[PDB]
Known about the structure:
By secondary structure, this protein is mostly helical. It has one domain. It is built from six helices and two strands, in the order H-E-E-H-H-H-H-H. A two-stranded antiparallel sheet has the order 1-2. Strand 1 and strand 2 form a beta hairpin. Helix 1 packs across helix 2 and helix 4 packs antiparallel against helix 6. The longest helix is centred in the C-terminal third of the chain and has 14 residues. The chain is globular. It is classed as viral protein.
Amino acid sequence: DLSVEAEIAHQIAESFSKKYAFPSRSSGIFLYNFEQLKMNLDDIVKEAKNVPGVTRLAHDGSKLPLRCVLGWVALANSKKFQLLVEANKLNKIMQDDLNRYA
């Protein structure tokens, strides 16, 4: 579908610079945004569709779980993000995010 791509692209573009908190390996949190992926918007949208539920949510026009989407796309595309992030805590976060946005 291409209308869901538009909504995903629009919600991601509006928040493209917004900083989100992800768990670190040292401790605490580090900040990340979509911009630091160094990826083109079209590529992020394409990758965001792997996140469970976001295509349905975008079809309905609901707010997307952007922190969960960013962490998902980053875990798959940024070797630096992978090395900064504690994956176990990221996993649980993205899981809890998707259950709240149900």
